[PDB]
A and B are shown apart, each in its own frame.
Chain A
């Protein structure tokens, strides 16, 4: 209604401000590090 000061009301977040993933991008570097870590095992099967 009509108010002079201190509306004291909560609000929802701003529309579309929560952006999200979707694009068909390549693997994360944590996965790249797991590939390299498992390679240290695979190479060792053919090495001393």
Chain B
């Protein structure tokens, strides 16, 4: 049906705890940040490794917060 409103401290993101970043719904700002960190598709689809990567994003403030600080370059 509808999506849950709880992502108000996060952002738009194709990530899930079961299979990781869905590269078909994954945002371009996300792929950007991950390539400069040296992350591969194998790691983005690792539900274990992608969780660690995502835990940092929802921490700072979500996809929007990482973008604000990415835009410094």
Contact = CB atoms under 8 A, between A and B. Distances in A.
Interface residues on B, range: 10 to 19
A21 B70 CA distance: 12
19 contacts: A26-B73, A27-B36, A27-B37, A29-B69, A30-B60, A31-B36, A31-B37, A31-B70, A34-B34, A34-B53, A34-B66, A35-B37, A37-B52, A37-B55, A38-B37, A38-B53, A38-B56, A40-B52, A41-B49
Contacts, number: 44
Contacts of B52: 37-38, 40-41
A28 interface: yes
Which secondary structure characterizes the binding site on chain A? Answer: helix
